[PDB]
Amino acid sequence: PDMTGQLVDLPEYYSWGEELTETQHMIQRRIMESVNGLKSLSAGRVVVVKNQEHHNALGVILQVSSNSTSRVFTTLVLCDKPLSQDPQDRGPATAEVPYP
Amino acid sequence: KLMSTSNTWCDLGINYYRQAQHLAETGSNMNDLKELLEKSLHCLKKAVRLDSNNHLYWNALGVVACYSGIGNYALAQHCFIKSIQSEQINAVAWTNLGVLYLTNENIEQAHEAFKMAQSLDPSYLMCWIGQA
Amino acid sequence: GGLRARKLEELIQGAQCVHSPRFPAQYLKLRERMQIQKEMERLRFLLSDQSLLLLPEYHQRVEVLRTLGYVDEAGTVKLAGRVACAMSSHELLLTELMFD
């Protein structure tokens, strides 16, 4: 490829994108890994949920499972009301570039 | 005559060398053995060019090259170095270089060659004699 | 890490590729090549010699040999080394005793 001009920082930006993510995950580990985080996690807590299911949907934790080994959080998370009943409309799309 | 190989060429050169050595050592003559030495050099050179990847031929040519009747030390040094490069595990060539340096008042460098040579073969006699 | 995150956010908010006409395609191709190249690099490391767990200790041993007089530079055995080769046990101490 040719990156001379408007594309000069395209790879380096990419690097900045990659390293940053590990840091959040490291930060994310230092969020779930801490005993104090493990203490704050209880009822009356609003959380941001990020997975294939919830994409940065805001949720509020209702309870924390008694087994603090397998910490299962029964949490109310908002999602779009499903205006469909068929899993066939989901198909592979363009790989989402990380924008600013 | 009936089977022209390199080893026989080298051995023939050594035989001519021995004849010249015998004539000189009995003081029987001098300057009348020149043709014998040139013949010896010719045979050794023919052997070396026939197969120039054998430490034996380079070593034999080097030793003959430094005989008192010829006295061409540069060629001898070259031949020993080529023999060492051709096959690195060679105490004989190292000790011959050590002798070459030692006779020409180079005590330190001859010591280096002898010490390394015995490093390569701890039970070779001449290196120990040179050290003594 | 948090300071690095802040700086990466600052850099991410100014990229020129985001404004380029050919931003998505070249970028995805760059993703593929870097990921594959990284996997090759790890693969070669696994196939390399540095993978050996004990290699630094081998280097330390050869250095210990070289400070005493047993091995020349570029690894050729010296006379003391070949003496200590054919020895039953405690080769270093016995051969050192002989030379001293």
Interchain proximity A100–C15, CB inside 8 Å: yes
Cα Rg of chain C (Å, integer): 27
Q: How far is CA C80 from the centre of its chain?
A: 31
Residue A63 has a CB neighbour count (10 Å cut-off) of 11
Q: Which of C12, C31, C32 to mutate to test the interface with A (most CBs of A within 10 A)?
A: C12
Angstrom distance (rounded) from CA A49 to CA A52: 10
Interchain proximity C82–B122, CB inside 8 Å: yes
**CB-based contact A10:C27 (threshold 8 Å):** yes
What residues of B are in contact with residue C83 (Cβ under 8 Å)?
122
Physical contact, C and A (3 or more Cβ pairs within 8 A): yes
- What does chain C look like in DSSP terms, one character per residue? -HHHHHHHHHHHTT-SGGGSTTHHHHHHHHHHHHHHHHHHHHHHHHHSSTT-TTHHHHHHHHHHHHHTTTB-TTS-B-HHHHHHHS-SS-HHHHHHHHH-
Residue B130 has a CB neighbour count (10 Å cut-off) of 19
What residues of C are in contact with residue B119 (Cβ under 8 Å)?
77-79, 82
Angstrom distance (rounded) from CA B119 to CA A33: 61
Angstrom distance (rounded) from CA C81 to CA C68: 10
What residues of B are in contact with residue C79 (Cβ under 8 Å)?
115, 118-119, 122
**CB-based contact B45:B79 (threshold 8 Å):** no
Three-state SS annotation for B17-78: HHHHHHHHHCCCCCCCCHHHHHHHHHHHHHHHHHCCCCHHHHHHHHHHHCCCCCCCHHHHHH
Q: Could you tell me the two tokens for B88?
A: 């690195």
**CB-based contact B37:B67 (threshold 8 Å):** yes
Phi then psi dihedrals of residue C93, to 5 deg: -65, -45
**CB-based contact C84:C92 (threshold 8 Å):** yes
Phi then psi dihedrals of residue B95, to 5 deg: -65, -35
Q: Could you tell me the two tokens for C46?
A: 């696994």
Cβ-proximal residues to B120 (8 Å cutoff; 6+ apart), any chain: B89, B90, B91, B94
The beta-carbon contacts of C79-88 under 8 Å, at least 24 apart in sequence, are: C79/B115, C79/B118, C79/B119, C79/B122, C82/B119, C82/B122, C83/B122
The beta-carbon contacts of C3-8 under 8 Å, at least 24 apart in sequence, are: C4/A19, C4/A20, C4/A23, C5/A20, C5/A23, C5/A24, C5/A27, C8/A16, C8/A19, C8/A20, C8/A23
Cβ-proximal residues to A60 (8 Å cutoff; 6+ apart), any chain: A44, A45, A46, A47, A75, A76
A54 three-class SS = coil
| Bridge partners, B110 (sequence order) | none
Looking at the partner chain, which of C5, C8, C27 has a beta carbon nearest the beta carbon of A10?
Answer: C27
Resolution expressed in Å = 3.6
Method: cryo-EM
Q: Which of C3, C6, C16 to mutate to test the interface with A (most CBs of A within 10 A)?
A: C16
Judge whether C98 is closer than 8 Å to chain B, CB to CB: no
Q: How far is CA C7 from the centre of its chain?
A: 30
Name the residue type at position A22.
E
Physical contact, A and B (3 or more Cβ pairs within 8 A): no
What residues of A are in contact with residue C11 (Cβ under 8 Å)?
13, 16
What residues of C are in contact with residue B122 (Cβ under 8 Å)?
79, 82-83
